[PDB]
Amino acid sequence: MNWTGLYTLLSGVNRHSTAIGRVWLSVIFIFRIMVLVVAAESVWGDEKSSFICNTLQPGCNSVCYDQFFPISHVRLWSLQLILVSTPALLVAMHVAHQQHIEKKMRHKVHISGTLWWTYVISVVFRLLFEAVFMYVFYLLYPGYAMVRLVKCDVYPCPNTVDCFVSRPTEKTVFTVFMLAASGICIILNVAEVVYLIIRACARRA
Amino acid sequence: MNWTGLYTLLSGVNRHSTAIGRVWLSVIFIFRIMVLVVAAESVWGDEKSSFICNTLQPGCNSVCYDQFFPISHVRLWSLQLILVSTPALLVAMHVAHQQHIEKKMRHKVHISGTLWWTYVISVVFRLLFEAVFMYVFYLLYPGYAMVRLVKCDVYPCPNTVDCFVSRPTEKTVFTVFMLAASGICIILNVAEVVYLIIRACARRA
Amino acid sequence: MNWTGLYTLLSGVNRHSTAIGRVWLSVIFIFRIMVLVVAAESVWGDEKSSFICNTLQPGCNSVCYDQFFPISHVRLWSLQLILVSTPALLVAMHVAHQQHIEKKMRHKVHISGTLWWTYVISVVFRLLFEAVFMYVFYLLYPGYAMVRLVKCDVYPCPNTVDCFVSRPTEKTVFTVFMLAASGICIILNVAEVVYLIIRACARRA
Amino acid sequence: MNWTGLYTLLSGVNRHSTAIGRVWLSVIFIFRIMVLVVAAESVWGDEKSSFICNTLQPGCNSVCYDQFFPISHVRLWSLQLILVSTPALLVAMHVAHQQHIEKKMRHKVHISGTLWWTYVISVVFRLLFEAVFMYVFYLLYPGYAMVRLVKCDVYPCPNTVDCFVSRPTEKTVFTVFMLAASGICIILNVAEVVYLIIRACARRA
Amino acid sequence: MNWTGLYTLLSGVNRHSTAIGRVWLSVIFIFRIMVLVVAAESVWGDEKSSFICNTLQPGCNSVCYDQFFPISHVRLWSLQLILVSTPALLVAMHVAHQQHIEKKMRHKVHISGTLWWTYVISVVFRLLFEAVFMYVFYLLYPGYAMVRLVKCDVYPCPNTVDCFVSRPTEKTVFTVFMLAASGICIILNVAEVVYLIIRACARRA
Amino acid sequence: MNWTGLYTLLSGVNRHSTAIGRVWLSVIFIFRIMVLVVAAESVWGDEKSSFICNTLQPGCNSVCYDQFFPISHVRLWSLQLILVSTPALLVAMHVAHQQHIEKKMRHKVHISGTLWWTYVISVVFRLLFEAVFMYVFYLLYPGYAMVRLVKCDVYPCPNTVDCFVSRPTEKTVFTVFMLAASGICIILNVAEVVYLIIRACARRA
Ligand SMILES: CC(C)CCC[C@@H](C)[C@H]1CC[C@H]2[C@@H]3CC=C4C[C@@H](O)CC[C@]4(C)[C@H]3CC[C@]12C
Ligand SMILES: CC(C)CCC[C@@H](C)[C@H]1CC[C@H]2[C@@H]3CC=C4C[C@@H](O)CC[C@]4(C)[C@H]3CC[C@]12C
Ligand SMILES: CC(C)CCC[C@@H](C)[C@H]1CC[C@H]2[C@@H]3CC=C4C[C@@H](O)CC[C@]4(C)[C@H]3CC[C@]12C
Ligand SMILES: CC(C)CCC[C@@H](C)[C@H]1CC[C@H]2[C@@H]3CC=C4C[C@@H](O)CC[C@]4(C)[C@H]3CC[C@]12C
Ligand SMILES: CC(C)CCC[C@@H](C)[C@H]1CC[C@H]2[C@@H]3CC=C4C[C@@H](O)CC[C@]4(C)[C@H]3CC[C@]12C
Ligand SMILES: CC(C)CCC[C@@H](C)[C@H]1CC[C@H]2[C@@H]3CC=C4C[C@@H](O)CC[C@]4(C)[C@H]3CC[C@]12C
């Protein structure tokens, strides 16, 4: 597991990506993966059982947890990580496939231009996915701090029982870490698009 | 774990598959595997215990869960993934075996034609398996949204107790993701069959 | 993890096995392993706790589960998989050992004949093990469908309490899959024996 | 993970071991490891909780389980596997060390003789360990069949409550498998010692 | 997994780091990782359930644990390990990227100087992160010894119930180990900065 | 995973260690690791829950377990294994670093002498750590046999309730195994120091 291998794997063997994607984006992906793993394995553990309510009627706890947490934070970050990693996977497979096609046997200039457009559009899609997940996170959970207690009131629960959230401060810390990682990813993606466009326009002149 | 190795592994070292199977189908397989892993490990966890009913007679919960969920979604997707991956496995083993037979020592043209027919029939079988699992999913679970509560009524359960489903919205989200992945796989398989047939007929002329 | 490596590993580097064992038998072994893993990890989970009875006397549930399920299906398939995989392991080790002995330094014709007989006898033993496990499965569990409820009556259980089986339809589906895989393995083993004998007799003439 | 690598790893790169140790002993070790893994992971699971007694005084179940099962079967087989595998590990390390010493720079004949004696004594120790564990198994658990129920009577338990054993028939099956594997290992070890001594004496003449 | 590979991986292939970072810092990182793994897997296990209170009102235990342990020690050390490992990751990626850029085709002297400044600033950031986490640990948990029992008093808990901490002495031991590892890391980082600055100034003269 | 690789990895690529450390010490480390893994995974499982007391006041069990078992045996052996393995890790990193420094470009004689002193001092530290952990084990747990029942009397526990220890005989067996492994490690370390000193003094003459 040498460093050249890990760097090449995270780079995607893409000859158009600049140092922002080669170094900073890959590092932040590693950082976000590690934080997500820690949060998933420890903080949001059996989150169904951790979320407790002062009630005795069966099923009241389950409905309240679904009502106040339609999607748990880790699952949303898991989906976000998968979705934003998909265009990178597509670009890597495209590069590998083009290498294979070349290996079977100018047209190479056309291939390079196609790869350039593919990478730029992939970064734009990655930026859009990050922005969409950020907006979804804002829509589901206003603010950045985990709620401590909630006043649940739903059909299986009579008398408007109140429920408590396990590890609220710890979850707030990890929420800030994940949001910060996503925000910096957005900044880097915008920087890559601008840098590539500027360099391409300068080369055109 | 270089990208050439992963691309070759997912391709099956099949010289007749086009860029649709080399790139798009493999990527969607990776995407579907990751979503399934997340859903299996977190969303559909101890699904037997999550599905709860407001009753005290032992065994009522188990029978109700079996009555309304004959096959849980993850198991159906697990079987679907195994079944649709089987023809790809068969083609890969056929290619490896033909390479071995050649390595022991025109007939190679006949081998190439046999591989071509094998791949085309394998894609047709993969398409049929995807369609069958899609129809089974429609038959077992009408619609695309997880039911929130059900009115169970079976022998161990008196008085027609009602049961609640854990994480209904989250399960709906993953259901849509899995259905979308399966649908795009169907589209790509049809495209590969049409593309191969068109190219073969053009070559015949 | 290239395809040549996986194909060679499953083949056993046996120069007498035909395409049936190289391709079809190995694929079905992979398929059976995957289905067994899914069934073991999810379907037959904590099968002791899943099997429930409407009784309060401690130990009644344990005795009833032992009385109606002397050996759980997954353990039987696990033992079956180990036993039927053993002759393949023996042949692979024999081939490796013969290569080592040759590497230390006609007699090679005698070695080839010994390997031929070893492979044929190994396939016969594999067929016998499959048939024996099939008969044992028939003897323990008549039919192919998991029982839904049973009327247990044993010493710790008074009043002949009835017990329920968790996930009966899902277990039936996996039972059919495992039985089908075993049946096709039997067919392929018979085909290999017949094909080898026919080819050997033809070569004798 | 080629077959030559696995065969070499299990052989210990020992040039004095005959085909019995290269092939049959290694295969039985693999078989015993797999059966032990299955038994440990499934059959003897939370064996403390599975062993149940019809009593309410806390700690009675724990003392009864300790009183009738001083050492659980899997732990005894785990210790047996470790102990009988230790001399093989010692021989492998000795061979590697001798290769290293040779690599630093007849004396090689003396080295070969020392390796021969080391291997023979290691096999004798392996045979003794197998016999000792077999005798211990006989001493702790007379017979070969798991007891179904026991009549416990110890200080925390009043009124001589009776306890039940979970999965008795399944445990009996695995016990027979493990005992059979150990017995065949004893036979093979005796055969190796006799074969080596006979061949050495014949060479002396 | 040879020693040269592990040493190179932990070194980051950085040609400016001295023997302090190559040897001592990497060893302490390994030591800290192992201690953290042991503490996470065993000592701080289901820490939510281990922390118990003599009360019956649901949710009181959860709020008390959050009130006295806003962030559990393992999570804080996990975040600390990730944060202090990040600059090392950045330097490694920078070195790999510079090697790639060189591989595409004095400027190399400028590259070496940039790498030198990058490494020095990274060590300073690593030192600052260690100091910040040390101060946070002091702020959250005064002293170095785990509290045995606490007198919780919060809204869901009436009558000021008292709670007990599981494994206090064991947690104290691991706390001292982790604090000692962090302290020595601080000392080594300061030593590296001073050594590099002294050597650079001497070279300037 | 060839034997040369494993032997080299456990040796540390140290050219001054004799056959005692190359072969016997490495083997005993492997043996101790395996026994510790078995004990940790099975014997000392959820040791908090296994240790039970005949009481109903919450938290009494936790305090009693902490009072009679300040540090559980597996954690002590885990810390012991980490601590005694640390000097071996330091020597391996030193050798790798010296190889790297040599690779950058008599002084080699000075390097060899420094490595010799480093190894000797490391063995002395390893011996001291083993002796210290042995004394700590004696201090915490007099004797070698696990206590069966204890008479706990602490603040949360009224009336001096008695507690029982799960699997006392099994834990005694593993305790003897671990103590024996540590004792033989002490003997081998003393032998290595004496052998190296004797050989060095003889070479001086
Ligand atoms: C610059 C940054 C964003 C690059 C991100 C690249 C990441 C997302 C890529 C690089 C290598 C990829 C991995 C390569 C191989 C596998 C094995 C496969 O069986 C599951 C997916 C998995 C694990 C891939 C997931 C996506 C992955 C981790
Ligand atoms: C174009 C797409 C559909 C190709 C899909 C290829 C997938 C289904 C193939 C490619 C490599 C294959 C894997 C190769 C090796 C192994 C190891 C074996 O012990 C279990 C099965 C497993 C894990 C295979 C499962 C099927 C697999 C993942
Ligand atoms: C044609 C078909 C039936 C061939 C079947 C071959 C199977 C049964 C063989 C091929 C490779 C073998 C594996 C090779 C290596 C190991 C590692 C060892 O530590 C445990 C057993 C295990 C995992 C073997 C189990 C048996 C195995 C999986
Ligand atoms: C002929 C038969 C009896 C040979 C038996 C050889 C077995 C016992 C040997 C062969 C290879 C050995 C393994 C080689 C490497 C490791 C990694 C180490 O970190 C733990 C022990 C472990 C897993 C060894 C355990 C013992 C082992 C499995
Ligand atoms: C001198 C000391 C401080 C160097 C510390 C280097 C450590 C922090 C570096 C060296 C190798 C790195 C690992 C290399 C590869 C991977 C795989 C990736 O999928 C997750 C992160 C992970 C596991 C990295 C984490 C950070 C890591 C462990
Ligand atoms: C002669 C005897 C005492 C030598 C003992 C050497 C042992 C203690 C050394 C040899 C190889 C080392 C391992 C090499 C690589 C890694 C990976 C790292 O991410 C965690 C630590 C770990 C697992 C090391 C732990 C210490 C280790 C196991």
Numbering used by the authors:
A (entry chain C), B (entry chain D), C (entry chain E), D (entry chain F), E (entry chain A), F (entry chain B): 1 to 105, 122 to 221
Paper text:
Connexins are transmembrane proteins which assemble into hexameric hemichannels (HCs) at the cell surface allowing the exchange of small solutes (ions and molecules of molecular weight below ~1.5 kDa) between the cell cytoplasm and the extracellular environment. Two HCs at the surface of the neighboring cells can dock in a head-to-head fashion, forming gap junction channels (GJCs). The GJCs connect the cytoplasms of neighboring cells and ensure their electrochemical and metabolic coupling in a process called gap junction intercellular communication (GJIC). There are 21 connexin isoforms in humans, with distinct tissue distribution, channel properties and regulatory mechanisms.
We used HEK293F cells which express Cx32 at the plasma membrane and form functional gap junctions. Both drugs inhibited the Cx32 HC activity and the GJC-mediated dye transfer. Once we saw that Cx32 reacts so dramatically to 2-APB, with a substantial rearrangement of the N-terminus, we were convinced that the choice of 2-APB for our study was clearly favourable. Our results suggest that drug binding to site A may affect NTH-mediated connexin pore gating.
